[PDB]
């Protein structure tokens, strides 16, 4: 995605992680052609995170790391 998106998206232990929705709820925060960066720790959003944007309507970004807190990015494309 825009990985260069500027937004507030972080989920700690939200599975999908729990933040899996942080994206879907992000698309509403951002706008098409935009990007948003999310994070988590549950290590679930890493898999779902890339699913939130799928519905959110933002570009599919790439950002996954399980060192303390995961996160995902999405380029608003609604």
Swiss-Prot record:
Please give the superkingdom of this protein's source. Archaea
Q: Which organism is it from?
A: Thermoplasma acidophilum (strain ATCC 25905 / DSM 1728 / JCM 9062 / NBRC 15155 / AMRC-C165)
What the entry lists under PROSITE patterns is as follows: UPF0033
Which residues does the entry assign to the active site, renumbered to this chain? 16 (cysteine persulfide intermediate)
Q: What is this protein called?
A: Putative sulfur carrier protein Ta1170/Ta1414
Q: Which Pfam families does the record associate with it?
A: TusA
**Family in the record:** Belongs to the sulfur carrier protein TusA family.
């Amino acid at each position: 995605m825009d990985v260069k998106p500027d937004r507030v998206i972080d989920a700690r232990g939200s599975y999908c992680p729990g933040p899996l929705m942080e994206l879907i709820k992000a698309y509403k925060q951002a706008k098409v052609g935009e990007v948003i960066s999310v994070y988590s720790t549950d290590a679930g959003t890493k898999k779902d995170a890339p699913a939130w944007i799928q519905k959110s309507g933002q570009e599919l970004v790439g950002v996954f790391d399980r060192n303390g807190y995961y996160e995902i990015v999405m380029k608003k494309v609604k």
